[PDB]
Design an enzyme around this catalytic site. Structure first.
Site, mmCIF file in Angstrom:
data_model
loop_
_atom_site.group_PDB
_atom_site.id
_atom_site.type_symbol
_atom_site.label_atom_id
_atom_site.label_comp_id
_atom_site.label_asym_id
_atom_site.label_seq_id
_atom_site.Cartn_x
_atom_site.Cartn_y
_atom_site.Cartn_z
ATOM 1 N N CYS B 105 0.844 -1.201 0.000
ATOM 2 C CA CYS B 105 0.000 0.000 0.000
ATOM 3 C C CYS B 105 0.884 1.258 0.000
ATOM 4 C CB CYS B 105 -0.947 -0.035 1.224
ATOM 5 S SG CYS B 105 -2.244 1.233 1.119
ATOM 6 N N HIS B 125 -0.052 1.486 -3.498
ATOM 7 C CA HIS B 125 -1.403 1.981 -3.709
ATOM 8 C C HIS B 125 -1.368 3.049 -4.800
ATOM 9 C CE1 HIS B 125 -5.347 3.815 -3.031
ATOM 10 N NE2 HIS B 125 -5.666 2.667 -2.459
#
Lengths: 188, 188
Positions: B105, B125
């Site tokens: 992420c 991400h």
């Protein structure tokens, strides 16, 4: 008015099945209370993750009612839920007021223990099917998420995202669920 | 010999990205240490889930080395990781001994902060891409899980299962990962 969710957390609960719905529901703007079955003390989950509840179940019981009551899975967590008279009272009250009840994995076997939602179509983790179906009081489904009336069930840790988004959809509608889903980078 | 994993937990970490790898790795028989960046005290994650670490990072640092170091995401968690000199030391040591480094992420942006693995192909991400690519020191990938040498990265909360199983596969092999995967009821 802000929707409210009660997550009941007992020793031996599956920590992934607990944290994913809590996180996703709070992303949806729902006020979530993680209530410890045994009190306010930290709870050791099935894979030794230790989570601090927001409140004891005794205290959270007084701040109802809740738009959804969430029962995580984990074999030993579900057994603790099945043996608790406080959980029985909460679930029966929620059933009578036609509030949503959501249970995942082994969690639905607590509904059987407390005689909740007999006649509903439900799913469980495959390893909990026989337990759930003792007596034939429910109709079994192999869908990853199943919703029959006010009873929403799901199968396992890998269905936790779909389970949580189904709760959001039921409470806040399809558009909010879709908005919350996009930043998660889910496959489908 | 039992494999060992270090999960570094900082305030603001994404709790789903923390609990899923910890749970799955322990299902695989890996000895996982959830180490608090700031000490042994409970850590408030990005969506207010409070997790108790197994140890402080200072204490866990002394019980190395680890076969994998895991950096969860969450924007503020990743910022805290990026600013920590202790994390820099751990990561540089792990890089030098050719141990696995796994970040998900927003977590990979800590690799940039500490100058780890320059020249590798990485993913993040989508909202962290620009930050990761400042200076062009990595090559960006949009794969849900990316592994280049000893650097394993993943994109978001919804990729956490694939991320965790990739770690298991790297450490314990394909068969263990497949055995651990089946009871999770994952879609693909």
């Amino acid at each position: 008015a802000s929707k409210r969710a009660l997550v009941i957390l007992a020793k031996g609960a599956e920590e992934m099945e607990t944290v994913i719905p809590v996180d996703v529901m709070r992303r949806a703007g729902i006020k979530v209370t993680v209530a410890g079955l045994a009190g306010k003390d930290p709870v050791q989950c099935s894979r030794d993750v230790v989570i601090c509840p927001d409140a004891s179940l005794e205290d959270a019981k007084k701040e109802g009612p809740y738009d959804v009551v969430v029962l995580p899975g984990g074999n030993l967590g579900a057994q603790n839920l099945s043996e608790s008279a406080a959980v029985k009272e909460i679930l029966k009250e929620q059933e009578n007021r036609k509030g949503l009840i959501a249970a995942i994995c082994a969690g639905p076997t607590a509904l059987l223990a407390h005689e909740i939602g007999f006649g509903s179509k439900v799913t469980t983790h495959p390893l909990a099917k026989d337990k759930m179906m003792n007596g034939g009081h429910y109709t079994y489904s192999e869908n990853r998420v199943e919703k029959d009336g006010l009873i929403l069930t799901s199968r396992g840790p890998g269905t936790s995202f779909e389970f949580a988004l189904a709760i959001v959809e039921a409470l806040n509608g399809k558009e909010v669920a879709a908005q919350v889903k996009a930043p998660l980078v889910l496959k489908d």
